[PDB]
Write a protein that binds this ligand. Structure first.
Ligand SMILES: COc1c(C(C)(C)C)cc(-c2ccc[nH]c2=O)c2ncc(N3CC[C@H](CNS(C)(=O)=O)C3)cc12
Length: 557
């Protein structure tokens, strides 16, 4: 019952890999301690292969089968449509990994006959064959972090032709099923503003609230064949077209359960008997499995008035406290149950009695004040990884702009407003690239966004208060300041000075640029401009944004 077996062949790159932070003329204005920033490469993949390779033991009790039966009853109310080739092709990112069969993502997006023909033959083969393991590529991801070094994460993905077929059979399932099965517990249905509201409302609804986050050590590797067959049995409860049922059963037996791993050089690296990180069902499967195991663990631990918030492999639980002794013992029993279900933790969970102390999705709730002095709750995170990635993106073009996603998702934060908006609007002004649409990810899905649309997007996700927050918490300020000293980032006063320049430059330009200057940099000036709602905010087609998670799912919206 090993998560992986290996041949000894190495995980190889597809191009030249840089691990050291690239430096240009704009680097120093953002970050001085360059040596602190690094990118993971395939050369550390051997260290990751060791960490993810282990035996899985699974003991399934009555709480587990009880929760499963309820999940299946809710799943039986779902009706899912089969997507056409064209529809599935349009969901493919432009920079998605090319096929081994002579076509790429642009060919798929342009509906080229060679791509469309191969997709049809892959589909027919899924319907005809339910036993042949589907080949996957194993690659090391190149992700940027600040030191204290993490080994590269591994991405396991089938061919582009299989990926388009997964969309046809399961895109509607993975987009509609989680919210039906989990209701309000499904976290990917919420914008950051709706998630804040949900958590504060849940925390308030308890007499003596207690909360914790459960961090499973390498979740993908803890996912067993049993778990993947349980997920398929959940998908099979839906009202599906007969071709979709057969494709789902085939994709499960041939791909989802496991299969051979091939490097970029076409060599066999070994065999996967756990979750693939680069399939359409990664996010949905992980969400369901985590919800199933955590809900059964909640029953085994006898947690009182339990409220969960699950999204992918990330889990937040809020419940009624029984005092620090009984809470510690309840969390030990919850951990023991999760361990038996093959989901042991990285760090053992800790009970928290202050909402602001619970960390999940690397985020925590914090408080600031609006223009009328009223308390406003927002989601924040340690700005180290966002700032390290922004330093990389200042000197190199990347297929996903993490700074853009970070401004969108963390717009109310002190660091996104003063540093990220200031730095990147300065770069866009100098290059006259304000109107150029940039790629970013929201819950694993890829989006092409125009920076000039940022004030309307932020209003819709966070409200106008996002442009007026002040009097941030001492804890938040100290965490931001501590990060700036560590990375060698200029103090917040320098950023204020730079923002007055960025704002004036945006205003001088009029139109949409002036709107950016007005709303995004109102914090920079003492004499504040009046921020009324934006007409274009209501015109925004923000559908598909907070519907589901698609991490590793190769989705473009
Ligand atoms: C819901 O919380 C999140 C927020 C909040 C709302 C806190 C701000 C913001 C982002 C996010 C941040 C920045 C850019 N884009 C984003 O999507 C975000 N991104 C991913 C995410 N995941 C939860 C676990 C998923 C990975 N596990 S897996 C492989 O099993 O699917 C990824 C949660 C997120």
């Amino acid at each position: 019952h090993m998560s992986y077996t290996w041949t000894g062949a190495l995980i190889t790159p597809c191009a030249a890999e840089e691990s050291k932070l690239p430096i240009n003329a704009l680097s120093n204005s953002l970050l001085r301690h360059h040596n602190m920033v690094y990118a993971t490469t395939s050369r550390s993949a051997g260290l990751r292969q060791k960490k993810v390779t282990f035996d899985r033991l699974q003991v399934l009790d009555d709480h587990y089968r009880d929760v499963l039966k309820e999940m299946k009853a809710k799943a039986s109310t779902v009706k899912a449509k089969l997507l056409s080739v064209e529809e599935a092709c349009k969901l493919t990112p432009p920079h998605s990994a090319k096929s081994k069969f002579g076509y790429g993502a642009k060919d798929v997006r342009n509906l080229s006959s060679k791509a469309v023909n191969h997709i049809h033959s892959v589909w027919k083969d899924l319907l005809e064959d339910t036993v042949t393991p589907i080949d996957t590529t194993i690659m090391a991801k190149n992700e940027v972090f600040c030191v204290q070094r993490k080994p590269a994460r591994l991405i396991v993905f089938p061919d582009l032709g299989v990926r388009v077929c997964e969309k046809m059979a399961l895109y509607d399932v993975v987009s509609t099923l989680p919210q039906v099965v989990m209701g309000s517990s499904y976290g990917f249905q919420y914008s950051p503003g709706q998630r804040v509201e949900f958590l504060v409302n849940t925390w308030k609804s308890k007499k003596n609230p207690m909360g914790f986050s459960y961090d499973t050590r390498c979740f993908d590797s803890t996912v067993t064949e049993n778990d993947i067959r349980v997920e398929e049995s959940i998908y099979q409860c839906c009202d599906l077209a007969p071709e979709a049922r057969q494709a789902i059963k085939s994709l499960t037996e041939r791909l989802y359960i496991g299969g051979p791993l091939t490097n970029s050089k076409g060599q066999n690296c070994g065999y996967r008997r756990c979750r693939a990180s680069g399939v359409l069902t990664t996010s949905c499967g992980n969400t369901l499995t985590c919800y199933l195991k955590a809900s059964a663990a909640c029953r085994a631990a006898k947690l009182q008035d339990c409220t969960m918030l699950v999204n992918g492999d990330d889990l937040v639980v809020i419940c009624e406290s029984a005092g620090t002794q009984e809470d510690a013992a309840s969390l030990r029993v919850f951990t023991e149950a999760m361990t038996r279900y093959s989901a042991p933790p990285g760090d053992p969970p800790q009970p928290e009695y202050d909402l602001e102390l619970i960390t999940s999705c690397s985020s925590n709730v914090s408080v600031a004040h609006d223009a009328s002095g009223k308390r406003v709750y927002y989601l924040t995170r340690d700005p180290t990884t966002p700032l390290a990635r922004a330093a990389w993106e200042t000197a190199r073009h990347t297929p996903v702009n993490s700074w853009l996603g970070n401004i969108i998702m963390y717009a109310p934060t002190l660091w996104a407003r003063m540093i990220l908006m200031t730095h990147f609007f300065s770069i866009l002004l100098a290059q006259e690239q304000l109107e150029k649409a940039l790629d970013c990810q929201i819950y694993g899905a890829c989006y092409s966004i125009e920076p000039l649309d940022l004030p309307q997007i932020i209003e819709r996700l966070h409200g106008l208060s996002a442009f007026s927050l002040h009097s941030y918490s001492p804890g938040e300020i100290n965490r931001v300041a501590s990060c700036l000293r560590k990375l060698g980032v200029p103090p917040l006063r320098v950023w204020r000075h730079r923002a007055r320049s960025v704002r004036a430059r945006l205003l001088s330009q009029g139109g949409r640029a002036a709107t950016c200057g007005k709303y995004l940099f109102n914090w920079a000036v003492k004499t504040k401009l009046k921020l009324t709602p934006i007409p274009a905010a209501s015109r925004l087609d923000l559908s598909g944004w907070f519907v589901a998670g698609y991490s590793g799912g190769d989705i473009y919206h």
